[PDB]
Design a protein around this ligand. Structure first.
Ligand SMILES: Cc1nnc2ccc(-c3cc(O[C@H](C)[C@H]4CNC(=O)C4)c4cccnc4c3)cn12
Length: 125
């Protein structure tokens, strides 16, 4: 029981575009969360073996992390801003599913999610 391959970060059959919303997602949303004191546990895929998380990939079938989101934004993988927002939502939700209220990682995820919500509220129209 080890880790799956990380999520894809490049799709060569998918066209690429730069938009004002995608710029905001990289330059404000991802950058702010990535640089936060609590970001390190979320900067790469969950390594259930190194972290001793039994049954992680029996419980979480749609893993996501900020390292994947950063690479997707840097590679212009996202065509729609909603794809990126959905990945951040999946990352936080998985943490809440696997862990318990009051756990250190959940309190860290909640602080990052509050900051995510504050920044996404100012996504340009
Ligand atoms: C995402 C996601 N979803 N569930 C989990 C469950 C655990 C983790 C996790 C926790 C970590 O540290 C703990 C908060 C303390 C124990 N050791 C310390 O140094 C502090 C990590 C420290 C360095 C790198 N990666 C970590 C990943 C992330 N998780």
């Amino acid at each position: 029981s080890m880790n799956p391959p990380p999520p894809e970060t490049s799709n060569p059959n998918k066209p690429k575009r730069q938009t004002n919303q995608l710029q905001y997602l990289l330059r404000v949303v991802l950058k702010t969360l990535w640089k936060h004191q609590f970001a390190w546990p979320f900067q790469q895929p969950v390594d259930a073996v190194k972290l001793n998380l039994p049954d992680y990939y029996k419980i979480i079938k749609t893993p996501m992390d900020m390292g994947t989101i950063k690479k997707r934004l840097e590679n212009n993988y996202y065509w729609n801003a909603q794809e990126c927002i959905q990945d951040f939502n999946t990352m936080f939700t998985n943490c809440y599913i696997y862990n318990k209220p009051g756990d250190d990682i959940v309190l860290m995820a909640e602080a990052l999610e509050k900051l995510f919500l504050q920044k996404i509220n100012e996504l340009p129209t």
